[PDB]
Subunit: 389 residues, 4 copies
């Protein structure tokens, strides 16, 4: 029986996933995608490319209606009629949306054609994660839709400049993304919520802090950790959580509006909030770790170099710059780390960097790689520890 | 070990797939997608929705460059630099595009970082399938992009009008989709290539022609089969191919430009090409089968009703209207027959219809369902045979 | 490919096995055996029945030669010629024996045709497990060999008498098995080594000692636990190990030679060794638990009844008889608790007993079942707690 | 759920088996056995070695009762009581036998504790296959039970002589097996039925007969095929079936009592029955193929050499000797071909031979290997074609 074999496949894959860890499960999920692409028919490939786009649009509609948050708190299955009346949606529109959502597990449909939350419905109800999907719809989609004709019109140039990429055609502006987004309210509110989505796991999973400290001393009043562009300060919070009695200042540096947003969730003491533009010289001198997580990936090498050069003069012999960012391999890179590369090229003019490309960039700033501590698999995120040359 | 487990999963799924038939393989691929969605983390969900739409943009770039047809005819692996200089692409851009395409199997990367065609490469080199991908990019994506705000602005109506749906916002026009397309030369050219893609399997695999015919006589000059909106006439070709000695006229009906495009690939005898607009009265009287394949799905009930009412008066007691189209189930409908529903709502104001919905629509035309012959699984396509009430 | 499929099956089963517990692994191994029997051809069936018994003969040869203990302590692979000359075996015979043992995993053959220990090699080097294999060869096989003609000659009786079953034909004696063994020195020596094999898990993993005890008081000198036929006293040892501060005498009862063999491995204090024949009245009065592990299974109902009737008069209202033994299900019983049934019918005139059969036997002794605490799965071993009626 | 995972394992293994061919299924079955041995606990290993012997004894009882043939023709499940009364067996003995048989799939037990035939019950009802199991019980078992103490008493000699092996101790005789069996009636009747069990597949599956013929001519009256020790003549029957109009005599040679037994099932013409002792010179001169299937494996090299030397003088330049027999590999030999080696060493003093050992034996007879045509996998049976040197 085909159905019996399909059910047994699901049982065995679920059991294998449940027994391994998060990295093993991520490897299984990539394998399932690889198998799907290898087994689909030519017509299936075109159908998948035609229709998988609709998930983001329909997730946007569900978020506009508040469907996912409502469904995630319901204690019993709900009919399409009940959901439509409660959320203020046309009854047959609601039924068609739910049918589509159930077919891509954005909700679950029951045997009496009612609806309950799935793992994805819960995810889309979380404000920082819902903001990621809304960001894909309103910011990434227009840039991806502009890039084929941008490249055609310009005879397929190598994109190297944040002010000359697809973003400018998509949003009909001459400034780079970061400035243009400075001026748009709805954009900024969603961006704001995006900063609250903390990624797991983080570099402290694998970072051998005591080993990297060596005999460095916090006396008299030195800084252990300067989180440059630290956003809501998640790195600082987790550092103090895991090393609560390690001496030394822990300093969150960002722009004033972001630090004001961070105060609500920062600890009452132990973490300093210091306004600092990372395009200016670093004010904290001789810190042990100058930390840049998911900062440099957003800049082409000219601008990423200048961010590092503003830090290097503050370093003493024991100081390290810690770049925590994607480190895709030379070959066999996965879709999450090559898709990111196409999107940041499109929007920001920047790129993902292999380990060799990170080392070449850091060498231009007078820096040498001392250690690399991977903390995610199979997609590579790592804390790279750089010394003065 | 993790790598060993993952490779073993792929070996076993590949072996199970190779041993079933096309419908079994489609069930396996549906299960692999559901497993992927159930096993992904919340961050995975957002990254998948953020990045999967980039595949359509990058397939459109590869199509613009001629990359897939070139790779498909290459006899050895090609370096990124060879492809870049052959195709007129910047070398760094080409390398980044190929890394991304290899990660989603749109090409294959070798272990010395050269590139060869995949199944997907070959698919995207086929003119009609390439055109389906290009249609997704240039026609489906803008309407999906406009749908959320269109729904919000209009307070979530039940869309029933081809001249009042998301299409009008997306392309800033008051025309309905079909009329507007007819004014756009590049778009109509790509649609004509799309008509050359023949779906498989087809209704003749399960349609019991002999039993439906009974003692039906073709004399003096009656038609056995009238293919209304038949495009390239693939249904007429396959009919004549399978039943070459069955008497009766076989008539392809479409608008003049499509009939002209069809002449190259039609048989020299046995199939008549008859210009006919299906919004006007059917000229062929008393035919055995009036055949509508993937036609009525593109019209709201009002207009689909009118198309049937243009045929009904031409029928005698033995005539049948055969609707060959999607018949999704009442529950558990699959993504390829619910995502279509959302797309055709947004572009055409139309919908997919369950069996009960087809029968209700046909009853307003004075017709009753005699038989239903499914020929695809698990996504339902069927030949629905209707007679006068 | 066939080889690839086969290796993938083994990878996936090994991964599933490693992730469950011992009971899950036992269920998997039962399923593998049932799959093997359902998939074998008719000729396979006969070859399996023809050849699988050779493994006991060749394990007995390896034991005679000392091969398994020698291989288990070897630090590198050994050639057949090295093993032959070390162990005193003809070189061709040794090579043929090793080829056979490698094909059933009793050793492992390397790719340069040398030999190393397997899990099974290590098992057969353990004195008590070696003795179980030697017992199968010298005691179980002759009785199984005599059973078919014994049944035929006697017109298929229901065997109920330890002095009238297949044992008497197999060893050409009128004695019952236990008495005859006691006259055979080599056999009794191997049985004494067999007593050193401690089964795991044991009843204390699920026995709720505190709840069964209640407010039971040990003073002035009552016994908490009387281990009747306790062998090496493993139940007493594990009892004292798990509940070292529970007051009350713990008493191992067995015949003098077994108590003497037990002295080496008993604790120096806390467990009394008391010579007692369980076919005679129980000397310890009013103990909390009189414990019979794998005792009553070796006696037909008449004699098992007598053993219980020798204990009952020693009981007070708080005393319990704990029968720790196999409790096979009414249906779906597994091969390891039905093959035992056939063996003990043939050698001892005994039987395995379902829960209902245990309760019927205990009721003739005046006892009622209070509780049943299973501690192995899927083959059922349980501690059955009986009180006076 | 453990049960759910176990059920899914069975479903997936059954589906993989059902889709491959008989050789793929034989590889899967060997893998399942390998997994069982690797996953069992030390106690399980001893239990399996103690109890798997009982299958042959209980199969013997079932055959004595006629249970398997009766159950194989029953049209509905039968209770233990019904079977006991019909077959003349004690009711509780019958119930215990059926419980054991169901646990090793020798029958199947239903959910209402009744019994139906399994694949193994059908196999054991077939007279030639039942005779193989009875042969294992009455002929192979006594020799395997004698071999450990035979080897111990004789200080582990290399066994090379049919008149000095374990057989002589097992059956208290000084003659080799073949003569001693000449004198025992029950033995001979069962042996007789054994000859009717035709193995599948056979060498004609893969033997390129037309290629091996070359330009050999049957004119005037030459023999195509001389089946030496051909038993019931199955090789001759299948040769004429697959090559019904190939010219040349086809001759079955055996001892007179076997050829009289073969007449009932030989074709009415086309196959000659010729009495011939293969220890005498071959009377048919210049045949194309002199065929020896499963003959030489039963003889030590001295006697196997003399059988070949009696054929060689009859050969002309185009004649071939075809040895069809087991050809185990140099390493990694499977249990069916190494267990056979131990049993024929025990009973007959002979051995399985690798390809190199066959070539060494044939070279002593003046013969050279021309071709080897395997026809079973993974256990190697092959037709080896030898020429004059
Ligand atoms: C990817 S986000 C947050 C990255 C942060 N390290 C983390 O892991 O959450 C980039 C951060 O850089 C900050 N940022 C952007 N421009 C900056 C500038 N010129 N100076 C300092 N911070 C800046 C943003 O405000 C935001 O908090
Ligand atoms: C989705 S295509 C289907 C073609 C065909 N039934 C098949 O299965 O391939 C729709 C067809 O309808 C035709 N069509 C659109 N409007 C029409 C009209 N007013 N009258 C006749 N044909 C029309 C198009 O030219 C096109 O060939
Ligand atoms: C199967 S062994 C079981 C030992 C112990 N109950 C255990 O679980 O290991 C049976 C034990 O019963 C003992 N036994 C046999 N006959 C006995 C008798 N008449 N009185 C006391 N013990 C006896 C033997 O010496 C042996 O130690
Ligand atoms: C393994 S059995 C049958 C083998 C046969 N080639 C086949 O594949 O069925 C061995 C055969 O050799 C025959 N045989 C034994 N001694 C013989 C002898 N001295 N001369 C001729 N045939 C003999 C037996 O009668 C029996 O038919
Ligand atoms: C020729 C069809 C191409 C694809 O667009 C359509 C259309 C369509 C959409 C916009 C403009 C014109 C027609 C109507 N009706 C369908 O069914 C599909 C499906 C087609 C294939 C992929 C998914 C779509 C929903
Ligand atoms: C100490 C037990 C050894 C094994 O023989 C027995 C015996 C037994 C048999 C013959 C003579 C003396 C005792 C009784 N009662 C059992 O239960 C087992 C099982 C034992 C382990 C393997 C399978 C057997 C049926
Ligand atoms: Cl479809
Ligand atoms: Cl047990
Ligand atoms: Na890339
Ligand atoms: Na061997």
């Amino acid at each position: 029986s085909n159905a019996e074999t399909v059910a047994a496949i699901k049982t065995l894959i679920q059991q294998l996933a449940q027994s391994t860890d998060q990295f093993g499960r991520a490897e299984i999920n990539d394998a399932l995608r690889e198998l799907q692409y290898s087994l689909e028919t030519p017509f299936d490939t075109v159908m998948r490319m035609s229709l998988d786009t609709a998930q983001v649009a329909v997730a946007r509609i569900g978020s506009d209606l508040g469907l996912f948050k409502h469904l995630s708190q319901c204690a019993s299955p709900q009919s399409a009629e009940e959901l439509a009346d409660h959320l203020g949606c046309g009854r047959e529109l609601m039924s068609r949306l739910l049918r589509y959502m159930a077919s891509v597990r954005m909700v679950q449909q029951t045997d009496d054609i009612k609806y309950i939350s799935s793992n994805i419905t819960q995810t889309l109800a979380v404000p920082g994660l819902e903001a990621g999907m809304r960001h894909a719809f309103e910011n990434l989609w227009p840039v991806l839709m502009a890039l084929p004709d941008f490249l055609a019109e310009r005879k397929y140039p190598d994109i190297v400049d944040a002010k000359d990429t697809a973003f400018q055609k998509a949003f009909n502006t001459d400034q780079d993304c970061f400035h243009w987004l400075a001026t748009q309210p709805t954009r900024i509110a969603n961006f704001k919520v995006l900063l609250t989505d903390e990624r797991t796991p983080n570099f402290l999973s694998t970072f051998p802090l005591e080993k990297e400290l060596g005999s460095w001393s916090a006396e008299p009043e030195k800084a252990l950790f300067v989180d440059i562009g630290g956003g809501m300060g998640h790195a600082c919070i987790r550092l103090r959580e895991k090393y609560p009695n390690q001496p030394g200042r822990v300093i969150l540096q960002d722009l004033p509006p972001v630090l004001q947003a961070a105060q609500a969730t920062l600890p009452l003491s132990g973490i300093e909030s210091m306004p600092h533009n990372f395009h200016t010289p670093q004010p904290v001198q001789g810190a042990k770790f100058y930390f840049l997580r998911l900062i440099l990936r957003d800049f082409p090498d000219h601008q990423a170099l200048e961010i590092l050069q503003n830090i290097v003069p503050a370093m003493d012999a024991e100081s390290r710059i810690v770049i925590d960012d994607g480190v895709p391999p030379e070959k066999g890179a996965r879709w999450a780390e090559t898709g990111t590369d196409i999107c940041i090229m499109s929007a920001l003019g920047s790129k993902e960097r292999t380990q060799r490309q990170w080392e070449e960039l850091a060498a231009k700033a007078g820096l040498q790689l001392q250690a690399l501590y991977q903390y995610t698999w199979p997609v590579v995120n790592a804390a790279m520890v750089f010394s003065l040359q």
